[PDB]
Every structure is written in structure tokens, then in C-alpha cells.
């Protein structure tokens, strides 16, 4: 009944009184220091559902990643608005990125092994330890690294560099390390005799990166 009696008392328009009574909009009793779009939320302000959700529960967004495509950012990483998340995915807001469902889990297992190697003497650089990537030796001319035991070859190839393991019966008699710059001349499951070349080492040979 216009002018609304409730409406007149509260300084609420016809539309406003409708929106609160019929659940189209919130009206704020105690802002508790909220601020929206740069201005502080003042008591008796009307909020839409979207405004209330941004205020009350915070703002967030979820971006689909094309199947098989891996993201250009890591789980937990702070992100600016506009930063590129995936080849086809661009983030719309600042905040913490969270992985939803990793399709592939890679476990890097820790291996600590004792392996031997033989090099000329004028060609090797003396160090007490070698960091990944560090130059191990420089060969004036190509050198053939030879088997020091007879056995069948168990070949284990890394990303770069290789491991080679000779065994008689099932007991490994030797563990060799082939750095980068050393090309295996034998294949897995190959029979070798003492003194035959396993790998050619040419030029500068260095620790692999991993």
C-alpha cells in the first residue's frame, strides 16, 4: 500500500523494499569493515548476490586445461592478473593457483650408487667432487674405455649420460659410469670379455645435468 508504510519509515524505495522482501538482494546490518569496489560497505547498503558472495566468501575462478596439456605454473604459485597459466589459458585474477586433479604423478626416486671409471691421466681434471654439469675430462684424441671384467651387460641409460653394469651369475661384478661425450658401443644384454671397448669418449666429457 503506497507509499509503503514500512518503506517510508526505513527510507527504502518501492523497488528496494521488494528486493529485500522477495530475496533478490541483501541489505547490510553490520558491514564488519567490508569494502567493495574501493569504497567501504556502509550499513543499510543493498548487495546483489554476486556482490555478497565476493564480500562474504571471496572471489575465485577455475580454468580448464585442455586434456594432456600441462600448465606453465606450479601448484601453490602466486599469480598476477593476466599471467599465462597454460598454452591456451590466461588467468583473470591475482591469487594462489591450486592444482585440481593431476593426471600424472612423477616420483623422482633417490638412488645413491658407487660406480667406477677409467680415463687417461693427461686428459682428466683433478677434483674431489663433481657437481652436475661440471667438466670431468678433456681428451686430446678419442679414448676407448674398455671392460675391466667379463660379463653380460645390464645397460641403464639416463636422460644424458649412461650407467653400465656387468654381471656373472646374477651378481654384479662392476658398475661403470659413462658421462656425456662417451657413446656406448655395447647394447643391453650383450656378452663382453675383459678388455673390449664399452664406450668411446671424445673431446670434453662432463657430468650430466641430473
Amino acid at each position: 500500500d503506497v507509499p509503503s508504510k514500512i518503506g517510508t519509515l526505513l527510507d527504502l524505495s518501492a523497488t528496494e523494499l521488494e528486493q529485500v522482501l522477495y530475496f533478490s538482494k541483501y541489505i547490510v546490518l553490520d558491514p564488519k569493515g567490508a569494502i567493495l569496489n574501493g569504497v567501504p560497505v556502509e550499513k543499510r547498503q543493498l548487495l546483489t548476490d554476486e556482490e555478497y558472495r565476493e564480500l562474504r566468501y571471496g572471489k575465485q575462478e577455475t580454468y580448464p586445461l585442455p586434456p594432456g596439456v600441462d600448465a606453465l605454473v606450479k601448484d601453490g604459485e602466486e599469480v598476477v592478473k593476466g599471467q599465462e597459466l597454460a598454452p591456451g589459458v590466461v588467468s583473470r585474477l591475482d591469487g594462489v593457483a591450486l592444482y585440481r586433479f593431476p593426471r600424472r604423478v612423477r616420483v623422482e626416486y633417490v638412488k645413491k650408487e658407487r660406480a667406477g671409471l677409467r680415463l687417461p691421466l693427461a686428459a682428466w681434471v683433478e677434483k674431489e667432487a663433481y657437481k652436475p654439469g661440471e667438466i670431468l675430462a678433456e681428451l686430446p684424441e678419442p679414448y676407448l674405455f674398455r671392460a675391466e671384467e667379463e660379463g653380460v651387460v645390464e645397460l641403464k641409460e639416463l636422460e644424458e649420460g649412461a650407467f653400465l653394469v656387468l654381471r656373472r651369475e646374477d651378481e654384479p661384478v662392476a658398475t661403470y659410469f659413462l658421462p656425456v661425450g662417451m657413446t656406448p658401443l655395447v647394447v643391453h644384454g650383450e656378452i663382453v670379455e675383459k678388455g673390449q671397448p664399452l664406450a668411446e669418449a671424445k673431446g670434453l666429457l662432463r657430468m650430466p645435468r641430473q
Binding site: 507509499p3 508504510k5 514500512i6 517510508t8 519509515l9 526505513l10 523494499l17 529485500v20 522482501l21 530475496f23 538482494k25 541483501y26 541489505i27 547490510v28 546490518l29 553490520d30 558491514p31 564488519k32 569493515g33 567490508a34 560497505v41 548487495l47 564480500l55 562474504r56 566468501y57 571471496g58 575465485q60 575462478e61 577455475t62 580454468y63 580448464p64 586445461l65 594432456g68 596439456v69 600441462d70 600448465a71 601448484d75 601453490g76 599469480v79 597459466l85 597454460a86 589459458v89 588467468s91 583473470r92 585474477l93 591475482d94 591469487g95 594462489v96 592444482y99 585440481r100 586433479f101 593431476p102 593426471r103 600424472r104 604423478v105 612423477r106 616420483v107 623422482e108 626416486y109 633417490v110
Partner: protein
């Protein structure tokens, strides 16, 4: 972990874990607060900057927000957000009406009455007429909102067996039944902790049921009997109009000791 013992992924030996190919990336505007020891706030609690989160007071919150406790990542997330009080419906309005000191508003509105532009004085008058109305009368504005809804005595909305043994009933009974259902259903949805979307829908339906009972058709579509276009006759409809209570049973009546014939 998986549904059945097979297909689980168990770590073969010592190693470190890397996550790849996520289904989607969720960007949250939030602060991350890692914790080594026990965490003292559980998830869902609301928190203000400086409030102690975990590890006996070592780690605390930088923002106002909502606690998300990640037991995998071993971190307490705080999603930036406020304890803001904002409501919908007649519940909200009844509070603001309760929170009225009419004395003060009269004072305020009188000060506005000392002002040109005529319109300022005109609107302050209309407001002041409602304020003064309540003050003299003794009515509390929050009474314009119903908590208990009255139910008219039954003989005034009868269910009677007519000649044929058939039942005839007043429309008010159907309007009340709708009301009762929605009230009862609302109580159940509350006790069962339905999401706000469901409770909001029920609450707004409840307003509509009360609205049809008091004045049907006044706001929104008129409530009708199933398979009839006839608007149900509400209390407002009963009071008013040519057929209404005043012009039919009050200002004129059928009478005894009367007759009629051709002249």
C-alpha cells in the same frame, strides 16, 4: 588411493613427488600459512588479521578471512572475506524496524522541516506523519511483520456436508494449507541444514503463501484452485467490494418477516 586395493599408487622407495597435468587450475585470492605442528583453528572458522592460527601462536593471519585447513599440503589457507552481516527477507526488515527509536527520527525529521525547495519539507512531512502516527497510537513498527499468523475460527471458514453428502469448503482452508505446508517444510529444511539456495527459495515461498492468505492477487499471480482459473478468495477479498462483508452483510441484509409479489 583408489576404490580397490589394486590400482593404488604406492611409493617404491625413497623419493620426491611432482604433480603434472592437472584437470583444471583454480585461482583463489587467498593467503597461505604453512604449519609444521598442530593447528588450533579448524576449517570454516572466520578469522581477522592477527588471530592465532597454528603452532601455539607462532603463525597468525594477515587478512580478514575464512579458514581452509589443508591436511595434504599441511597449510592453513585464509580466503580473503568478511564476517559481514547482510540478510534477505522479512527477517531483515523486522530487525531494522525493531531498531527504530522514533523519538530520534522525529527530532531528525523536524530539523529537515526547516528547509527550502518545498520538496524537502514535503517528503519530511510524509515520513513524519507515519512516525507521529506510531508514536501517538502506541503501535510498534515491527508489528507490520508477522511472527505468529492468526487463524480464523473454523465456523467462519466452514467445511460442511451439503445435501448430497458432498463436502463444500471455504477457500481460506486451502490458503491456510499452503501456508502450513511451507512452514512445516521450512522447519525441516532448517533442521536438516539445507544450503542457502534451498532455504532462500522456501522462505520466499513462505512470504508468498502469507501474501495470498491476507490479500490474494495483491502481489504476483493470484493463487487458484487446481483446474480452475478462479482466484481463491482471501481475507482482503472477503472484506471489500460490493460482495464484501461491509456492503453485503453489514450496511444491508436479508430480513425475516418480508415478502414480495406482483403489484
Amino acid at each position: 588411493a583408489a576404490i580397490d586395493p589394486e590400482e593404488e599408487v604406492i611409493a617404491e622407495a625413497e623419493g620426491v613427488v611432482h604433480l603434472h597435468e592437472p584437470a583444471s587450475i583454480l585461482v583463489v585470492k587467498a593467503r597461505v600459512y604453512p604449519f609444521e605442528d598442530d593447528v588450533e583453528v579448524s576449517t570454516g572458522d572466520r578469522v581477522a588479521p592477527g588471530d592465532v592460527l597454528a603452532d601455539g601462536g607462532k603463525v597468525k593471519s594477515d587478512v580478514y578471512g575464512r579458514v581452509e585447513v589443508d591436511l595434504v599440503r599441511n597449510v592453513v589457507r585464509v580466503v580473503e572475506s568478511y564476517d559481514i552481516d547482510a540478510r534477505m527477507g522479512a527477517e531483515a526488515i523486522q530487525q531494522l524496524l525493531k531498531e527504530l527509536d522514533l523519538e530520534a527520527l522525529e527530532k531528525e525529521l523536524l530539523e529537515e522541516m526547516k528547509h527550502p525547495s518545498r520538496a524537502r519539507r514535503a517528503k519530511a512531512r510524509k515520513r513524519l506523519e507515519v512516525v507521529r502516527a506510531f508514536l501517538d497510537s502506541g503501535n510498534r513498527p515491527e508489528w507490520m511483520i508477522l511472527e505468529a499468523v492468526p487463524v480464523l475460527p473454523p465456523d467462519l471458514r466452514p467445511m460442511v456436508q451439503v445435501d448430497g453428502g458432498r463436502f463444500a469448503t471455504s477457500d481460506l482452508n486451502d490458503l491456510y494449507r499452503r501456508l502450513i505446508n511451507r512452514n512445516n517444510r521450512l522447519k525441516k529444511l532448517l533442521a536438516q541444514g539445507a544450503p542457502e539456495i534451498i532455504i532462500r527459495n522456501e522462505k520466499r515461498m513462505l512470504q508468498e503463501a502469507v501474501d495470498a492468505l491476507l490479500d490474494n492477487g495483491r502481489r504476483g499471480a493470484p493463487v487458484t484452485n487446481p483446474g480452475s482459473d478462479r482466484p481463491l478468495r482471501s481475507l482482503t477479498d472477503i472484506l471489500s467490494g460490493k460482495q464484501g462483508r461491509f456492503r453485503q452483510n453489514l450496511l444491508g441484509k436479508r430480513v425475516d418477516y418480508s415478502g414480495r409479489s406482483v403489484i
